[PDB]
């Protein structure tokens with residue numbers, strides 16, 4: 001009923017039809033970090049009110065396609081560029097995610113529950129503004145608590161949770177008398193239970209990041225050439241289709257039942273190009289581009 | 293002195309020359325899981341004595357190229373195919389990694405310290421053979437403890453350490469009085485301290501796995517078309533070169549200092565192919581192949 005869909009049909013289907021398929025076949029959890037943002041700016045040219053827009057646009061796209069939970073890493077530890085202006089403008093962006101007008105409408109409009117994960121509480125400056133963002137985060141997380149249609153997790157310094165898990169477990173054992181389950185551990189870092197990530201949509205260099213405890217061999221990885229904001233309707237559907245129907249294809253192969261020619265034709269697909277590799281690139285104006 | 297090396301020269305350099313470069317520029321830690329093994333068999337055709345060989349060959353290659361630590365996931369939780377023969381032959385393979393002759397020579401020959409990580413102790417069957425492997429693992433880890441030239445970590449059910457970290461931390465706090473440092477936590481899971489992974493060399497489908505606490509945005513990802521054992525001298529060097537010189541290229545870009553044509557030529561590199569994505573593939577005889 002659902003497995004008979006072709007790529008062509010999938011790409012021609014109405015939005016609400018694709019959503020129903022994703023709701024049933026997944027991906028249930030998708031990691032979409034916002035990359036190539038500054039660059040994106042010195043292209044097509046304000047800014048924060050723009051990046052914000054594109055963020056809302058892409059998030060809107062992802063949720064309207066059936067995806068329930070979107071893990072979106074936004075701030076990395078490399079944040080300490082030392083420029084207080086860089087830090088001040090960063091916290092300003094963090095402020096919009098919880099104080100902005102249209103974005104709050106977005107949450108209410110599409111019933112989205114917002115969560116924040118990372119070592120931001122420990123890392124954020126012990127100043128007025130910084131402490132305000134933390135309260136804003138805590139406030140929002142509870143403000144949208146009533147929304148159950150979609151879930152959004154923002155990564156603020158969420159590179160490695162190891163030490164965080166250690167302290168969480170030590171406290172949990174202290175009050176409970178026994179160690180927490182994996183489920184409980186995940187609820188402690190993300191605030192709520194989240195399933196492993198089904199796919200990671202990156203950009204440029206082949207690399208994943210900022211989604212602790214939610215990675216597995218079953219997390220399909222994708223890397224667009226153009227930065228995140230450049231994503232189109234087509235690109236997404238092709239990514240979804242590959243994940244749902246192609247990644248884990250069934251029935252599995254059966255060599256002991258194939259002709260000597262098929263096995264022969266297959267071996268060629270490999271030995272044809274002996275040194276074929278995906279991930280190696282070339283640089284143009286300081287920007288890395290994947291070859292092939 | 294070291295940054296002036298071209299790809300061509302790098303590919304023509306003697307083995308010992310490449311090693312000296314890797315020893316200095318890295319990668320210090322590389323994750324190389326052995327994929328496409330069964331398939332590989334119904335190709336070019338015994339078995340265990342072969343897979344073993346190729347494993348030793350590739351490991352030999354990696355270490356002779358300057359790489360100090362190789363994280364190699366070998367067994368995944370999907371192991372419970374239920375077939376006791378499948379499990380019995382699996383433990384047989386695990387036995388070779390610690391009882392084999394030539395492989396032990398390999399460790400002594402190239403001064404390699406072997407370590408095992410994963411939830412194998414809890415997951416391995418409470419039987420005679422299984423308990424023997426565990427003792428073999430523990431025995432080997434200490435037998436090669438004197439070797440300090442290279443380090444090898446085998447992943448046996450090392451998909452997620454969360455719960456493991458929880459219990460480790462609860463015990464550590466119990467005996468020490470305070471929570472363990474990230475360093476200490478890593479020493480507890482891998483047995484010894486290991487730096488983040490510098491690169492992951494996979495195969496086929498774009499996906500990473502089985503190297504907990506050692507992943508970061510700086511872990512260069514690579515995906516060969518042919519299975520692991522198919523790797524050649526060329527492929528490796530091209531992967532190393534891309535990582536060392538191309539991945540994190542410097543000096544970083546400067547848009548506010550480029551001509552309006554360069555920025556224009558750059559924008560084309562993206563808008564030229566608007567829906568370009570790496571990770572989407574096609575299936576041929578049940579086997580997924582990356583497009584592009």
Ligand SMILES: C/C(=C\COP(=O)(O)OP(=O)(O)O)CC[C@@]1(C)[C@@H]2CCCC(C)(C)C2=CC[C@@H]1C
Pocket residue numbers: 034035036037038039040048051052053055074075090092093094227
């Ligand atoms: C520092 C920065 C981009 C740097 O990222 P590089 O990847 O270093 O940019 P390049 O490499 O393309 O030069 C902007 C921060 C951040 C979080 C902003 C913050 C305020 C607007 C908001 C939409 C929230 C937003 C969304 C995402 C973007 C990453």
Ligand SMILES: C/C(=C\COP(=O)(O)OP(=O)(O)O)CC[C@@]1(C)[C@@H]2CCCC(C)(C)C2=CC[C@@H]1C
Pocket residue numbers: 326327328329330331332340343344345347366367382384385386519
């Ligand atoms: C189960 C198996 C391969 C299945 O892996 P798929 O990826 O399912 O194979 P495909 O997908 O290519 O059909 C063999 C196990 C294992 C660990 C063997 C075990 C004994 C020889 C030793 C060299 C140690 C060894 C090395 C690596 C290989 C994964």
